[PDB]
Each structure stands twice: as structure tokens, then as C-alpha cells.
Design an enzyme around this catalytic site. Structure first.
Site, PDB file in Angstrom:
ATOM      1  N   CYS C  93      -0.941  11.147   2.915  1.00 21.73           N
ATOM      2  CA  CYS C  93      -0.825  11.164   1.483  1.00 21.73           C
ATOM      3  C   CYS C  93      -0.296  12.672   1.106  1.00 21.73           C
ATOM      4  O   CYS C  93       0.643  12.855   0.345  1.00 21.73           O
ATOM      5  CB  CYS C  93      -2.153  10.844   0.795  1.00 21.73           C
ATOM      6  SG  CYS C  93      -3.243   9.759   1.744  1.00 21.73           S
ATOM      7  N   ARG C 122      -9.056   9.930  12.851  1.00 18.56           N
ATOM      8  CA  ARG C 122     -10.249  10.266  12.143  1.00 18.56           C
ATOM      9  C   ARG C 122     -11.312  10.390  13.166  1.00 18.56           C
ATOM     10  O   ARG C 122     -11.352   9.638  14.058  1.00 18.56           O
ATOM     11  CB  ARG C 122     -10.560   9.236  11.068  1.00 18.56           C
ATOM     12  CG  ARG C 122      -9.799   9.486   9.799  1.00 18.56           C
ATOM     13  CD  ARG C 122      -9.745   8.311   8.902  1.00 18.56           C
ATOM     14  NE  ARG C 122      -8.587   8.311   8.049  1.00 18.56           N
ATOM     15  CZ  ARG C 122      -8.461   7.582   6.962  1.00 18.56           C
ATOM     16  NH1 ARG C 122      -9.420   6.812   6.571  1.00 18.56           N
ATOM     17  NH2 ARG C 122      -7.372   7.625   6.275  1.00 18.56           N
ATOM     18  N   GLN C 140      -1.464   3.080   9.448  1.00 20.15           N
ATOM     19  CA  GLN C 140      -1.506   2.393   8.204  1.00 20.15           C
ATOM     20  C   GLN C 140      -0.163   1.947   7.758  1.00 20.15           C
ATOM     21  O   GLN C 140       0.808   2.544   8.083  1.00 20.15           O
ATOM     22  CB  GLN C 140      -2.063   3.285   7.137  1.00 20.15           C
ATOM     23  CG  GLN C 140      -3.525   3.521   7.182  1.00 20.15           C
ATOM     24  CD  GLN C 140      -3.971   4.526   6.168  1.00 20.15           C
ATOM     25  OE1 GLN C 140      -3.187   5.186   5.587  1.00 20.15           O
ATOM     26  NE2 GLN C 140      -5.236   4.621   5.961  1.00 20.15           N
ATOM     27  N   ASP C 142       0.934   2.642   4.963  1.00 20.32           N
ATOM     28  CA  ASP C 142       0.861   3.519   3.835  1.00 20.32           C
ATOM     29  C   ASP C 142       2.162   3.624   3.132  1.00 20.32           C
ATOM     30  O   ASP C 142       3.168   3.650   3.726  1.00 20.32           O
ATOM     31  CB  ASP C 142       0.489   4.894   4.351  1.00 20.32           C
ATOM     32  CG  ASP C 142      -0.311   5.719   3.382  1.00 20.32           C
ATOM     33  OD1 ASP C 142      -0.730   5.269   2.327  1.00 20.32           O
ATOM     34  OD2 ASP C 142      -0.560   6.849   3.720  1.00 20.32           O
ATOM     35  N   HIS C 144       2.947   5.850  -0.635  1.00 22.15           N
ATOM     36  CA  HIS C 144       2.342   6.621  -1.710  1.00 22.15           C
ATOM     37  C   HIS C 144       3.421   6.751  -2.762  1.00 22.15           C
ATOM     38  O   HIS C 144       4.434   7.418  -2.549  1.00 22.15           O
ATOM     39  CB  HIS C 144       1.912   8.000  -1.212  1.00 22.15           C
ATOM     40  CG  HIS C 144       0.833   7.959  -0.175  1.00 22.15           C
ATOM     41  ND1 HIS C 144       1.049   8.318   1.139  1.00 22.15           N
ATOM     42  CD2 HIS C 144      -0.470   7.600  -0.257  1.00 22.15           C
ATOM     43  CE1 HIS C 144      -0.074   8.182   1.820  1.00 22.15           C
ATOM     44  NE2 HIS C 144      -1.011   7.748   0.997  1.00 22.15           N
ATOM     45  N   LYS C 225      -8.780   2.819  -9.528  1.00 22.40           N
ATOM     46  CA  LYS C 225      -8.227   1.998  -8.491  1.00 22.40           C
ATOM     47  C   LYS C 225      -8.420   0.534  -8.735  1.00 22.40           C
ATOM     48  O   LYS C 225      -9.271   0.166  -9.460  1.00 22.40           O
ATOM     49  CB  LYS C 225      -8.827   2.378  -7.148  1.00 22.40           C
ATOM     50  CG  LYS C 225     -10.306   2.140  -7.020  1.00 22.40           C
ATOM     51  CD  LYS C 225     -10.741   2.533  -5.654  1.00 22.40           C
ATOM     52  CE  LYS C 225     -12.207   2.329  -5.437  1.00 22.40           C
ATOM     53  NZ  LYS C 225     -12.523   2.749  -4.063  1.00 22.40           N
ATOM     54  N   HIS C 272      -1.407   5.669  -4.118  1.00 25.50           N
ATOM     55  CA  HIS C 272      -1.564   5.472  -2.683  1.00 25.50           C
ATOM     56  C   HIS C 272      -1.898   4.010  -2.418  1.00 25.50           C
ATOM     57  O   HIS C 272      -3.003   3.553  -2.715  1.00 25.50           O
ATOM     58  CB  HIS C 272      -2.669   6.377  -2.133  1.00 25.50           C
ATOM     59  CG  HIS C 272      -2.633   7.772  -2.674  1.00 25.50           C
ATOM     60  ND1 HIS C 272      -2.462   8.877  -1.870  1.00 25.50           N
ATOM     61  CD2 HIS C 272      -2.747   8.241  -3.939  1.00 25.50           C
ATOM     62  CE1 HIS C 272      -2.471   9.968  -2.614  1.00 25.50           C
ATOM     63  NE2 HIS C 272      -2.643   9.610  -3.874  1.00 25.50           N
TER      64      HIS C 272
HETATM   65  C1  2CR Z   1      -9.498  14.788   0.039  1.00 22.28           C
HETATM   66  C2  2CR Z   1      -9.932  13.539  -0.754  1.00 22.28           C
HETATM   67  C3  2CR Z   1     -10.886  12.700   0.138  1.00 22.28           C
HETATM   68  C4  2CR Z   1     -11.633  11.519  -0.527  1.00 22.28           C
HETATM   69  C5  2CR Z   1     -12.532  12.035  -1.634  1.00 22.28           C
HETATM   70  C6  2CR Z   1     -12.415  10.733   0.533  1.00 22.28           C
HETATM   71  C7  2CR Z   1     -13.100   9.463   0.040  1.00 22.28           C
HETATM   72  C8  2CR Z   1     -13.927   8.877   1.156  1.00 22.28           C
HETATM   73  C9  2CR Z   1     -12.110   8.408  -0.481  1.00 22.28           C
HETATM   74  O1  2CR Z   1     -11.723   8.851  -1.774  1.00 22.28           O
HETATM   75  C10 2CR Z   1     -10.831   8.330   0.395  1.00 22.28           C
HETATM   76  C11 2CR Z   1      -9.980   7.294  -0.271  1.00 22.28           C
HETATM   77  O2  2CR Z   1     -10.370   6.553  -1.101  1.00 22.28           O
HETATM   78  O3  2CR Z   1      -8.649   7.256   0.118  1.00 22.28           O
HETATM   79  C12 2CR Z   1      -7.862   6.299  -0.468  1.00 22.28           C
HETATM   80  C13 2CR Z   1      -7.160   5.780   0.791  1.00 22.28           C
HETATM   81  C14 2CR Z   1      -5.858   5.019   0.511  1.00 22.28           C
HETATM   82  C15 2CR Z   1      -5.742   4.020   1.647  1.00 22.28           C
HETATM   83  C16 2CR Z   1      -7.183   3.726   2.031  1.00 22.28           C
HETATM   84  C17 2CR Z   1      -7.951   4.990   1.783  1.00 22.28           C
HETATM   85  C18 2CR Z   1      -7.990   5.651   3.129  1.00 22.28           C
HETATM   86  O4  2CR Z   1      -6.922   6.098   3.633  1.00 22.28           O
HETATM   87  O5  2CR Z   1      -9.112   5.735   3.722  1.00 22.28           O
HETATM   88  C19 2CR Z   1      -6.730   6.982  -1.247  1.00 22.28           C
HETATM   89  C20 2CR Z   1      -6.689   8.496  -1.518  1.00 22.28           C
HETATM   90  C21 2CR Z   1      -6.070   9.431  -0.834  1.00 22.28           C
HETATM   91  C22 2CR Z   1      -6.255  10.700  -1.479  1.00 22.28           C
HETATM   92  C23 2CR Z   1      -5.995  12.036  -1.474  1.00 22.28           C
HETATM   93  C24 2CR Z   1      -5.279  12.820  -0.811  1.00 22.28           C
HETATM   94  N1  2CR Z   1      -4.531  13.635  -0.369  1.00 22.28           N
HETATM   95  C25 2CR Z   1      -6.745  12.648  -2.658  1.00 22.28           C
HETATM   96  O6  2CR Z   1      -5.881  13.168  -3.651  1.00 22.28           O
HETATM   97  C26 2CR Z   1      -7.839  13.560  -2.185  1.00 22.28           C
HETATM   98  C27 2CR Z   1      -8.609  14.168  -3.385  1.00 22.28           C
HETATM   99  C28 2CR Z   1      -8.731  12.766  -1.249  1.00 22.28           C
HETATM  100 ZN    ZN Z   2      -2.893   8.593   0.033  1.00 21.66          ZN
END
Ligand code: 2CR
Ligand code: ZN
Ligand code: 2CR
Ligand code: 2CR
Ligand code: ZN
Ligand code: ZN
Lengths: 398, 400, 400
Positions: C93, C122, C140, C142, C144, C225, C272
């Protein structure tokens, strides 16, 4: 950002000589300035520049060890049935120069600088830009000193190196690389020498803040490993301090020692700061992103004319700027003033001098910085004085 | 074959200080990279290869088994997982072995050709990273060939043929040499001689007897090699293709095949092979080779439509849509600039074909074609023009 | 209703103790993975996406900017390069942002849709890593998406449509929820409102007011979302798809676009999005969902040829070759086994079709066809059969 891409007329490469640069005028201007700076320092710090040959009989290389270790990287040819090579290193010709006449101990240390053209073979596909070239000029100098003089020589080098780097905003890091398992000196040489290197290091950097890489030395001598960091946080090897105990033996180098009769061998220090002019330019081009500081810039001043009426006056300003020693251009055209300015900024000119009716009448220039800051209108004498100071002091932007 | 070079780099990819040595491929670049992959994959299918997918990070014990730990650790990115040493893969060549070892195989089954396009990483100093020639991250068109000793000549002959076929598409030339057992070597002499003999034989065949050079003692310690050098339009030389045999890796991983009956198991021979060398590297070659002017099939800028006038834009977009449906990489200039500029601006961008549309053309329901090197191909109907483009793509035609 | 149903289901893929959490995809497995990628890639082209390629490792300063260093570091693999912190990407992303920022972009370009199929890592605890459901390593699907704030409803509607379309191919069902602004959220209020209104609107249009539900305050701190949940044939629910707006993502990386042909810049919105969620995970879903009996287009065992006699084996290979040349994954049993046995065996291995060839077939250039589910189709000419298989593939037909 790309060393090569940034060929808005600095340098180019052609298939007829891959790995050898063509330096266009603006490109040359940088190369020459770098040489002029290094030479100004050499004179100040006790070096004499010498000139040496470019091709040699293989026998020289046999003596040096280049035949054994380096032959694959050399351009080899025949002359009159004899093998000859283009020089990859200055380091042997320098020895011959030192042997030209007998030397007394008081003379130490002798410091010879060589800016000669070197050639190393590399595969054509492998060559890119200035980072990997066939043809280059090192800011090489090879220092001949007594064994007691190592600490002072190294200390003095470090300041020189630091002084240069500071000019460009470039950081460095020092480590001591010590004797490897397969090595050619007597122990005595290595201990005295390493001890001095340590001493210099703990004075230059202080007791604590330098790592040792034990066993990482060259077979022929101990070294201080130097790595430099650019503004993008990339690391390069540009500077060297390398001791050589081998080359003095091979070429039978000696100095007469007070009570003598006897004689002793000098230590050789192969040293560099730029590494090569070609390599250093590449670093700087990226490090500044093509926005060079006023002293080194090949586009120092651009005059832009407000209208047709002030064009002759512009040529006057330009003449004065040029006589004062500056790399100056004049826009001259019917382009819009705002356009002219913007383009000049795009070209990276450090200063843009707008000349209109006011300026002409008062013999002044209205100054705009690269960054679009509005410096004042200044008289021609004042502007010139300003540039000289910028130049003389090697001032940075930031 | 005479020009100013344009190395790193025209702009289909770029590099950022946050990951020096790792490319960012812009849409036009990606398009090329994906097109190359597609071609190699089409070839793999036709030629008995199966592409597989493998892991990217491994425990250090793998590298210990492989020899990477002894020989390569310096160029590896090594890190800790849960107290255990791990590394990103430099090579696929070990994971492939584990795949061979998944289940018992028999001699009937040979030769098992596994292709891997996986991402590899090697460490290089940041300062010394420039362009695609020296990168941290690349994808090889790597493919291991597990075979019987008796099978080497054919498999190598088959490889060489695949390689030439690919190279001919691009106008690339090659030279082949044989490099033979070195002084410090690990195998049994017999396996070496049988292998080297089959290699010479393959060379005699393809290139012709007495027409190829030997480099005695220049082989790897783990096997004989056919050294390949390729030459581009500028007369530059590259190492992209490889054929390397390996007797060590099969021992290290205890690879076996069941011989006719159950008498024995024999160890397979491994041939590490490549044609592109790496996708990143091949592109870099091609970019220079062609001087930015890719052949129609491979071009990211195949067709550009230029509109004479507004009454015409709708027809173009309609034309553009037809080109897109047909599979072409097409762009349009609907802007109001004067024509000649439009044509020139497009030619500069290296569009293979410029399609000019006017009132007659709309009514005509057809197209007026200008070639990249400015040739006036003259007008055509849509359905034909498409047919003509389709043909250049299907055949992989080179320019004039 | 019946036991299930993954991991053990063979052949396809395996795990090794040298890289737990990272799959080895055997050739039949890869074949599935590649088909899925290819299907997604066809759709991307048809729907205005451009796939790009990105770096896999980055300096830690990128993760500091993104928020990963704060929020995600314990889920990441971190190592030193030249004395600086580095990590393998857990997400694409952030790299996508750098790509956007490569050159100035205009209101004309919006939306910009970049797909990335890159490898992600991960750092999960090893004991917890079972199968494809919980892995270290994945790709993925993916993308964005970058757009103007007025473009959200249209872009989301288009995504939903793309997504239903993919799921429909598999007989897979979905449910949609909207998660709204949390108590600790970072936007300006307006942007959230504007966005949330657009999302609800797309939802209303797509499924209607009745058919979706809202989870108030379950949004991410950085965006609203739409929750997507999919249901398999076993009535198991998975989350693979997502649509997640991000308002933070653009500020952090200083993204902007030109709104006019004057001097004004605005920030884009980032979406995303995913459909498969991961290719590793989507396969795991499909294996169970189908119980290893894949539909013909996606099957890695499309056709098995079975020979009645030794006298017929050469015609059989003739059949196999034609089938292969036609693009089908095909095998032959030339064994001495009873015909009844061969058939039952092919059916157990799950081949979609069994082609029985005997004297009449060789005489006629014909095949005698049996389906996976027994069921006797009868006789077709080799031509008819290939045409029939081509139709099933082309249409992506379900068994039922
Ligand atoms: C660093 C942050 C981590 C976040 C808070 C972790 C959480 C567990 C959750 O928010 C992750 C999430 O929902 O990602 C979802 C993703 C999309 C596919 C599935 C999920 C995926 O890939 O797992 C989307 C966000 C990606 C985001 C960023 C980037 N760069 C943000 O701007 C940034 C603020 C994320
Ligand atoms: Zn993303
Ligand atoms: C013939 C031998 C080749 C040597 C083994 C090559 C190594 C790769 C490495 O040791 C070279 C090196 O560090 O040289 C470095 C030079 C200094 C600038 C950077 C490097 C430069 O010019 O590139 C110093 C040595 C010059 C040396 C000699 C001479 N004559 C030696 O007495 C002789 C034993 C060298
Ligand atoms: C650990 C060893 C490192 C080796 C000694 C490095 C040498 C520089 C060189 O031999 C590498 C090489 O030629 O690799 C070539 C590869 C093939 C494509 C181009 C080149 C490539 O990928 O770069 C192939 C060898 C893979 C080898 C192994 C594995 N596993 C060996 O069994 C193992 C003993 C290699
Ligand atoms: Zn030297
Ligand atoms: Zn390999």
C-alpha cells in the site's frame, strides 16, 4: 534520479567507446573545478603533482604484481614483440620517480600526486555511467615516508579528507583493517604501523568510536577502511588510506639514514579522496540532485532581459560577470519574463538576474535565487562581490 | 550500429532511495516485463517445463546444506526469526531440489524440468547500484533440469534450441564455449567425462565440429559449463543465458531416482539454466538494443490515435476502443494541437503506429496510418488495419 | 455435508520445516495459482487497472512514514543493511504511493488504478502457522486506487461489480457491511461524511436498502470500509474482499493532484481493495469449496486418456498431443490395467473427462467420453471434443 539521465549536457556515452565518458562543456566545468580544488589543497599541504607515462612494458607489471593479480583487468598489447599494458594504477610509476635520485631521511616525507588516466577492462554490457567505467582519473597520490612518520601522515590525511568532504556535506566512517593470515611483511612492520594507525585514529576520532576489522588488511599492508555517505544515505568507497610494504621492496626503494652508509625502505601510502573524478561527479550529481553549489556549478548566473531595449545592457552585465570569472548565460529572447525565469530555475541556475529599465539606468541587477527567493536589487559591483564571497567560501545552499 | 548510448535510464522504471537497487516499474515498463514473462511461459509450456512456486525466506540450515553459507553469505540478507538464522533467497536452485524430493521418482519420469520465476535478493553496496545492471532484487527466468546422465546431450541440445529461438525474436547473437573440469573439483571423474563428452557432442551438432572453443579448466567446481555470451546491436556483450551442470547439489539434498527395476537409485544431474538471465537485466539490454523503439508486439506504445478535429473525436475514441478491444496498447490525442505537432510528439514517444483520423475516415470508417519512422502507410479500414496489427503481433515481427 | 477438506487434499502444495508458513506449489498447484492470476489480469485490463511491479524490501523510514513502524512492526521481518533498518514489505500500500508521486498528476488522470501482485511477508508465530489459511508468505490481489473525492461512489460501484463478477464465476456468495467512523478517527469530519454517504449510496444501488448492514464505529482510524464476507458451498464464511478508504495514507506521503489548469492542488483518496484477498488463501477456499473437484477451466487435471489396448497406445498419444496443443492439461494411462479400473482411477484423481480410446476411435479419429461423475457422453470426433472443451473453458462453465 540517475547520473546519466541528468545529462542535461554534462556527459554522454557512445558505443564507439563504452565505458569512457564524453564530457560536454558544462560537464567539463565541474571536472575541472574539482581538479582545481584538489590541486589548491595539494600545494597547501605539501604535495607535488607529477606526470607519468600511460603505457608500459609488462615487465613493470611483473615487478609490481599486477601481472599476477590484475592481468585480466588490463588492456594488453604488443609493441615490437613485447607485451605492453595500459596502466590500471599509477602506483608503480610513482616508485620509479622516487628512485630517480638518492634520498636522505630528512627529506621524508615525499608526496607525489598523480592525476593520470587509468584503464581497467570491464565487460561492455556491465558498463553503466560513471559508476562503472573503463577510463578514469584518480586523485591519486602515493606517499613515501619513514616508519616513524606514519601517524602524522595519516593524521594529516584525515584532515585533508575531512576538509574536502565538509565542503560537500559528505559524511564518513573509519575502521582499521588489520593484518590478514596470508601476509608479506615482518611482524615488526605491521605492529609499528598498526599502532600508529590506531594512534592517529584515537586522536582524530578519539579512543572509543572506531571499529577494528581484524584480519581484513591487504596482504601488502594495513589500511583504514573509509566509507562515505551521501545525502540519500547511500554509501560509497571513495577515500582510501592503504599502506604498502611490498611495493617498496619490489622496486628496491631506499633512503639514506643519517649514519649511512646504510639505508632503509620507505613505507608507501596509496591514498585518495575523490576516488576518481568520474566517480565523484556521479556521487555529487545525485547528492545534489543536479543543484550544485555556487562555486562548483556550471550554471552560476543567468541574465534575463525584460524587453528588447535592455538587451544590450544585459550583454554588458554578462560581460562583467564573465570577466569576474563566472559561468554566466543570458536569455535574450522574447519569451515572457516569467517564463524566462522559470526556465532558468529549471535549468538549475543558482542566480537569475533580471535586468529592466531600472537596472540599466542604475547599473544594477535584480536578483532571484534558484529557490525563487528575492534577493535584492544590487549594483553590479555589489553582485560581483557577493558571488566572489560565495565562491571563495565554497558556500553551501543548506 | 553506431550511436550515443542511453543507459540508466529512459523512464519505464525508476529507483528510490528508500529501496536502492530495487525497481519500481511504471505501467509502460511493467507491460514489457509482463510481456516477456508471457513469452517465456508460452515457450515453457510447449517445451516440457512446468513453472512452480517456491518460498522466499529460508532457515539458514538450507543454505548450510546448499553451500550458500560457506560461499555466499556475504551477499545474502540474513536475519533472525524467533532466534533462528534466516535468509532471503539468493537462488532458487535449492528449493527446487526439495521439490524433486517431494515424492519418489523413477527414471521413466526424467527429465523433470521445473521453472521458477521467484523473486531473489542479493546484497550490493548502495553507492554501487545503478540501473538494472546491478540490482538487489530481480527475477530470473530460472529453470532447473533434473536428468539422467544419459540424458544430457538431448536436454542441452533442446536448451540451446530454445535459447536461439528466443534470441532470434530479438535479433540477438550469441557465442558458445565449453568450460571443463577445474583443478579443484568435487565429483567423480567419470561423471565429468561423460558429461563433458555429451556437451561437446551437443556443440559439434548445433555449432559444428571444430567450430567451437574450449576453455580447459574453467568450469565450476560442481560441474561443467557451457559459457554463453550474447551480443546486442551496439556490439556490447552480456551474460544472460547459462547452462551449468551440478553434481554437488544432488548429493547435498540426497536426490535419487529409481532405476529401471529396483536395483538401485541413481542421482540425477542438475542443470541450472537461463535465457533472459533476469527480467530486469534483459529489459535493460533490450532498451539499449532497440534504443527505446520496441517492436510492435512488445511495445508499450503500439498505437496512438490523433484527431484532426472535434467532429472527429468521437470517431477516434471509437477507433481507440476498437484497438483496445483487439488487445492493443493504445492512446489518443484529442487535444487541439496542430497535427504535425501531434504526429511528431507521438513519434518522439516511439509509438509504433500513429493513426490519423479525419472526416474522410469517419465517413470512410477507416484509418490513415503513419509509421514510426514517418512512412506514410496510407489509409485503411478498421477491420483490415486491425488485421494488420494482429499479424505483426502474432508473428513477432521486427521493424524494417 | 461431509468431512473437510484442505491441506491433505493432494497433490498441489506442501510445506517444509525449513520455511514454515511458505508454500511449495507443486505443478498441479501452480497451475491453479497461475490460472487465477491470469483471470484477474484479464479483468484488470478490461476494467482500467494497470499492474505494476514494486520493491520487496525497504528502509525503515518508509515504514515510519506509513505507520507500520508504530502499528505493525512485530508482524514484520526486520534486518540491517549497511547499518540501517530494513524490512520486508507486509503491504504494497506504501510503494504505490511513491509511484503516484513519481510525476505530477492531474484531474484528467483520475482515477489512477495500480494493481500489485507482489510478495508479502508477515511474521506470525511458527506454531500457529497451519496450511494456507495462516502463512508467512503470500501474494495479494492488491490494488490501491487513487481518486477524487467525488469519484468514490462510482469507483466503489465499479469494484463491487467487478467483485460480484469474479465470485459468480465460482458460485460464491457475498454479504456486505459498512463500517463507519470510529471514536478515534483521524480525518476532518467532512471527508468522512462525504465518503460515508457515497458508500451507502453505492450499497443502496448495488444491493438495495434492505440487503446490507451498518456497523457503526467499526471503521478504521484512517478510513471507512465496506466489510465483505463470502460464503462457500459448505456454508463457511471467509473474508477475502475488502474496500477500505484511507485518508491518512495520502497525507503522510504528501500526495496531490492538480484540479485545474490553474494553480490548485488537492489530495486524492486512496482505496485499498482486494477480491481473492490472497492467492494462497483463495485457493484454500476453492479446494474445500469444490472438494477437490475443480471446474474444467480451472482444473489441473482436465482430461485423462485411457487406452484399451497396446495396439491403441500410439493413437492415444496422438490424442494427448492434440489435447495439449489445444491448451488442456492432459494425461494418459497406457498401463496394462483393466479399462474399468483405469476409468475409476481417473475419476478418483478427479479428471473432468476420461477419453476412452479403442479400435473404433482410432479408426474414426474419435474419442469415447466419460465424465468425472461417471456419466457416459458417447462418441465425438477429436475435433468435436476439442471444440467442446474449448467452449467449457471459454465460458468458465460450472459442473452445475
Ligand atoms: C500502518 C497501519 C496498520 C493498520 C492499523 C493495521 C490494522 C490491523 C488494519 O488496519 C490493517 C488493515 O486493515 O489493512 C487493510 C488491508 C487491505 C487488504 C487487507 C488488509 C490487509 O492487508 O491485511 C487496508 C489498509 C492498509 C493501510 C495502510 C497503509 N499503508 C494505512 O494507511 C496504515 C495507517 C495502516
Ligand atoms: Zn493498502
Ligand atoms: C598488484 C596488486 C593488485 C591487488 C592484489 C589488487 C586488489 C584487488 C586490491 O588490493 C587493489 C587495491 O586495494 O588497491 C588500492 C588502490 C588505492 C585506490 C583504490 C585502489 C585502486 O586503485 O583500485 C591500493 C593498492 C595499490 C597497490 C599496489 C601496487 N602496485 C600493490 O603494492 C600491489 C600488490 C597490488
Ligand atoms: C553455493 C555455491 C555458490 C557458488 C560457488 C557461487 C559462484 C560465484 C558461482 O558458481 C555462482 C554460479 O555460477 O551460479 C550459477 C547461476 C545459474 C544462473 C546464473 C548463475 C546465478 O544464479 O548467478 C548456477 C549455480 C547454482 C549453484 C548451486 C546451488 N545451490 C551450487 O550447487 C552451489 C555449490 C553454489
Ligand atoms: Zn597505489
Ligand atoms: Zn539453480
Amino acid at each position: 534520479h540517475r547520473r546519466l539521465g541528468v545529462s542535461e549536457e554534462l556527459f554522454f556515452f557512445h558505443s564507439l567507446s563504452p565505458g569512457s565518458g564524453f564530457w560536454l562543456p558544462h560537464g567539463s566545468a565541474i571536472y575541472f573545478k574539482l581538479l582545481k580544488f584538489i590541486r589548491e589543497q595539494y600545494r597547501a599541504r605539501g604535495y607535488t603533482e607529477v606526470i607519468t607515462p600511460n603505457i608500459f612494458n609488462m615487465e613493470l607489471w611483473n615487478i609490481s604484481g599486477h601481472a599476477k593479480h590484475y592481468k585480466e583487468n588490463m588492456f594488453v598489447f604488443d609493441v615490437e614483440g613485447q607485451e605492453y599494458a595500459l596502466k590500471p594504477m599509477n602506483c608503480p610509476a610513482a616508485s620509479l620517480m622516487f628512485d630517480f635520485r638518492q634520498r636522505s631521511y630528512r627529506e621524508l616525507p615525499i608526496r607525489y600526486a598523480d592525476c593520470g588516466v587509468l584503464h581497467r577492462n570491464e565487460l561492455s554490457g556491465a558498463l553503466t555511467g560513471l559508476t562503472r567505467v573503463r577510463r578514469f582519473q584518480q586523485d591519486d597520490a602515493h606517499i613515501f615516508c619513514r616508519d616513524d612518520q606514519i601517524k602524522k601522515e595519516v593524521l594529516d590525511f584525515l584532515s585533508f579528507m575531512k576538509y574536502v568532504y565538509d565542503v560537500f556535506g559528505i559524511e564518513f566512517n573509519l575502521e582499521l583493517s588489520t593484518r590478514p593470515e596470508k601476509a608479506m611483511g615482518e611482524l615488526e612492520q605491521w605492529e609499528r604501523a598498526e599502532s600508529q594507525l590506531a594512534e592517529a585514529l584515537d586522536e582524530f576520532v578519539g579512543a572509543g568510536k572506531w571499529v577494528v576489522n581484524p584480519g581484513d588488511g591487504a596482504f601488502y599492508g594495513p589500511k583504514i577502511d573509509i566509507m562515505i555517505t551521501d545525502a540519500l544515505k547511500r554509501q560509497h568507497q571513495c577515500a582510501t588510506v592503504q599502506l604498502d610494504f611490498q611495493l617498496p621492496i619490489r622496486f628496491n626503494l631506499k633512503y639514506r639514514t643519517d649514519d649511512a652508509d646504510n639505508f632503509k625502505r620507505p613505507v608507501i601510502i596509496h591514498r585518495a579522496i575523490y576516488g576518481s573524478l568520474e566517480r565523484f561527479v556521479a556521487v555529487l550529481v545525485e547528492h545534489y540532485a543536479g543543484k550544485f553549489p555556487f562555486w562548483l556549478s556550471p550554471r552560476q548566473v543567468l541574465i534575463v532581459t525584460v524587453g528588447a531595449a535592455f538587451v544590450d545592457y544585459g550583454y554588458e552585465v554578462k560581460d562583467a560577470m564573465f570577466r569576474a570569472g563566472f559561468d554566466v548565460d543570458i536569455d535574450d529572447t522574447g519569451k515572457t519574463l516569467n517564463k524566462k525565469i522559470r526556465e532558468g530555475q529549471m535549468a538549475h541556475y543558482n542566480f537569475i538576474l533580471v535586468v529592466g529599465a531600472h537596472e540599466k539606468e542604475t547599473r544594477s541587477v535584480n536578483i532571484r535565487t534558484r529557490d525563487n527567493k528575492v534577493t535584492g536589487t544590487k549594483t553590479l559591483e555589489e553582485a560581483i562581490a557577493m558571488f566572489k564571497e560565495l565562491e571563495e567560501t565554497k558556500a553551501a545552499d543548506e
